[PDB]
Amino acid sequence: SGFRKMAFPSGKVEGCMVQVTCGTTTLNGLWLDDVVYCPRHVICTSEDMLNPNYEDLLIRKSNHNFLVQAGNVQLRVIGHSMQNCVLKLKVDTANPKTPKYKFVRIQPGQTFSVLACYNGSPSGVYQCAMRPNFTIKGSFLNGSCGSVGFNIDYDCVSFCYMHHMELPTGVHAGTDLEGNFYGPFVDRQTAQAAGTDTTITVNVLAWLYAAVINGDRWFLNRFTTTLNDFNLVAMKYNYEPLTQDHVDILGPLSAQTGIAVLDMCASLKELLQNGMNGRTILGSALLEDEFTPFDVVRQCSGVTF
Amino acid sequence: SGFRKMAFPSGKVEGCMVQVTCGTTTLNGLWLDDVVYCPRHVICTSEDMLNPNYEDLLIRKSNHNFLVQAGNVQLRVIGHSMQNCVLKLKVDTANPKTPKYKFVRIQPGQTFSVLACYNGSPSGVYQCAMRPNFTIKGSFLNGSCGSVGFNIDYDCVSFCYMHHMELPTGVHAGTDLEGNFYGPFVDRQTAQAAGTDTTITVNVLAWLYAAVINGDRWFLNRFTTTLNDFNLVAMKYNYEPLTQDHVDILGPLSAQTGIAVLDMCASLKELLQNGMNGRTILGSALLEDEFTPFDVVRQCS
Ligand SMILES: CN(C)S(=O)(=O)N1Cc2ccc(Cl)cc2[C@H](C(=O)Nc2cncc3ccccc23)C1
Numbered sequence: 001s002g003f004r005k006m007a008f009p010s011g012k013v014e015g016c017m018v019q020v021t022c023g024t025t026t027l028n029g030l031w032l033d034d035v036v037y038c039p040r041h042v043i044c045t046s047e048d049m050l051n052p053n054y055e056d057l058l059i060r061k062s063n064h065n066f067l068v069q070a071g072n073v074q075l076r077v078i079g080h081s082m083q084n085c086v087l088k089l090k091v092d093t094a095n096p097k098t099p100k101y102k103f104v105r106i107q108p109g110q111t112f113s114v115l116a117c118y119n120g121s122p123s124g125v126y127q128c129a130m131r132p133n134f135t136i137k138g139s140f141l142n143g144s145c146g147s148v149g150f151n152i153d154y155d156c157v158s159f160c161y162m163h164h165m166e167l168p169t170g171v172h173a174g175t176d177l178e179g180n181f182y183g184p185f186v187d188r189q190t191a192q193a194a195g196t197d198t199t200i201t202v203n204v205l206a207w208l209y210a211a212v213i214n215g216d217r218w219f220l221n222r223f224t225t226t227l228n229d230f231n232l233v234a235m236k237y238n239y240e241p242l243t244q245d246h247v248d249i250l251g252p253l254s255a256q257t258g259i260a261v262l263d264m265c266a267s268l269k270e271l272l273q274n275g276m277n278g279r280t281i282l283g284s285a286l287l288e289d290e291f292t293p294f295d296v297v298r299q300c301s302g303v304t305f
Numbered sequence: 306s307g308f309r310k311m312a313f314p315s316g317k318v319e320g321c322m323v324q325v326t327c328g329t330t331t332l333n334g335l336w337l338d339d340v341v342y343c344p345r346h347v348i349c350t351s352e353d354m355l356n357p358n359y360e361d362l363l364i365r366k367s368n369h370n371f372l373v374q375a376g377n378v379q380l381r382v383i384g385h386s387m388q389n390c391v392l393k394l395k396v397d398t399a400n401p402k403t404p405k406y407k408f409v410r411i412q413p414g415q416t417f418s419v420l421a422c423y424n425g426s427p428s429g430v431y432q433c434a435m436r437p438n439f440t441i442k443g444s445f446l447n448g449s450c451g452s453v454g455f456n457i458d459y460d461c462v463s464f465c466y467m468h469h470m471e472l473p474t475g476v477h478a479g480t481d482l483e484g485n486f487y488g489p490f491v492d493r494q495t496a497q498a499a500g501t502d503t504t505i506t507v508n509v510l511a512w513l514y515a516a517v518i519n520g521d522r523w524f525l526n527r528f529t530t531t532l533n534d535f536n537l538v539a540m541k542y543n544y545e546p547l548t549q550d551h552v553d554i555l556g557p558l559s560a561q562t563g564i565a566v567l568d569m570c571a572s573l574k575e576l577l578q579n580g581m582n583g584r585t586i587l588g589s590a591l592l593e594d595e596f597t598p599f600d601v602v603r604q605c606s
Pocket residue numbers: 041049140141142143144145164165166167186187188189190306
């Protein structure tokens with residue numbers, strides 16, 4: 001029993017975090033084999049961030065301009081190259097703690113763990129979701145740039161996010177590990193804003209099934225709905241459209257609890273139109289959308305890494 | 306900006322998780338130097354749990370009855386002893402991954418990270434608080450016994466909790482790393498129940514100061530309160546009494562934001578009276594009590 005927002009164990013990622021300094025800027029880097037990955041804005045200064053030509057700023061830097069620190073040991077940079085918005089620093093030493101890994105690009109709604117770091121030192125780990133507007137509601141301060149997002153599947157670490165910046169609403173923007181931004185964001189000091197956000201419907205449904213598994217049934221009803229009727233209701237409440245793929249993905253949870261996906265949708269419709277009426281679901285007065293169907297299955301089954 | 310429930314990086318603890326097997330029972334152990342710590346109920350045969358005599362069950366055991374597995378390597382047990390509700394298995398290999406550590410006993414209201422494990426394999430990490438009723442609202446399944454709670458301030462891991470059991474309300478009970486239970490609980494399957502739980506007042510106040518630091522001020526008011534009038538109101542909402550120690554502890558946050566502790570207490574009084582009125586504080590529709598004053602300073606500053 002119990003349902004917590006749970007992160008993956010961060011150990012395999014902790015062994016890869018390094019400090020990257022270039023000029024007056026210090027941020028975090030990911031050391032995998034003999035390459036250190038970090039945001040390319042590490043080469044930028046005060047005037048530079050306003051309108052930066054990164055190829056021009058990069059051609060002016062030499063290997064020794066980049067200071068890489070792994071714990072109390074300085075790594076020597078022997079090469080440098082740019083791939084989209086990520087800088088790749090070739091180092092002389094391969095990381096002996098390099099885990100089995102992949103670089104993966106996630107879709108909005110998918111969740112991941114973030115190992116927040118400052119000066120190449122991990123300070124905390126939290127779980128979060130890629131919002132439908134491509135931002136993450138994270139917890140970051142200055143010097144957190146280069147912190148990474150990941151999932152673990154068996155013994156393989158899938159790196160899916162690298163932190164680049166904070167937007168004026170307090171939300172965060174970043175890239176996959178190939179340097180491609182999530183969302184319509186650019187790595188520069190300019191007027192940018194997150195678009196109107198929506199609720200991740202398949203995730204709320206998964207969390208309602210987690211509540212049923214933990215013994216919370218007050219919200220269930222005798223009713224069912226159609227996918228078409230529910231999608232009209234969901235669109236009215238800034239909820240993401242629920243697709244047939246979402247319905248299929250929820251199949252295992254529907255079989256385990258005996259509540260058809262469109263039966264749980266009729267519960268969700270009633271919650272959206274009437275509220276909770278002073279009640280909570282899993283200790284929450286709001287409908288939680290940062291647990292995927294797979295996160296619910298993993299936590300309510302005990303999968304280990 | 307942003308305020309999340311944050312756990313400590315679990316790496317230093319992952320390198321200590323082992324599987325402990327005695328007969329048909331398998332649970333988790335903490336391998337530090339040449340000792341493996343685990344709940345002493347690993348020697349019980351289910352029926353034993355109603356009225357176990359641990360001294361009588363342990364005297365019947367030898368070193369080779371305990372199977373310890375660290376990854377794919379079996380450790381050899383060379384000694385065994387009981388300290389309160391913890392079994393200490395002396396092993397022939399010191400853990401090369403032993404971090405700098407301490408055993409600390411925490412007070413209710415204190416927070417910590419839990420590395421939930423099954424078969425000596427870590428599956429997840431989450432942030433918890435010791436409830437005023439000495440239970441923890443964790444997320445644990447069968448086989449999670451022996452999972453540990455910790456804080457990592459600087460490079461030193463302070464182990465403060467070891468999981469032992471789930472109570473009938475779904476909440477969890479356990480011990481410090483010296484085997485002393487938190488609360489009036491016993492490692493026995495007798496009728497036990499968590500006492501009425503209360504809200505950790507000093508933690509809610511700390512979280513209201515975190516909201517002010519992040520720019521949320523809608524809940525503040527022009528009022529102040531005496532400490533006594535605040536506690537008379539707080540007790541009616543099942544909130545823990547706020548002590549002078551709590552007021553002193555909140556001093557730094559009061560100085561940083563310019564809002565006196567008793568002024569912040571008046572806002573809390575009003576929030577308990579009025580509810581949120583469709584608003585949120587730091588993305589929450591409920592008053593959060595699992596962030597200490599120290600956690601707020603650590604994350605916001
Ligand atoms: C107005 N800015 C927030 S700034 O500090 O001047 N800024 C400009 C900027 C522009 C472009 C890019 Cl790609 C990066 C960045 C950096 C940036 O977003 N860093 C930060 C990241 N995360 C949390 C932060 C929390 C407080 C401050 C910075 C934070 C730095």
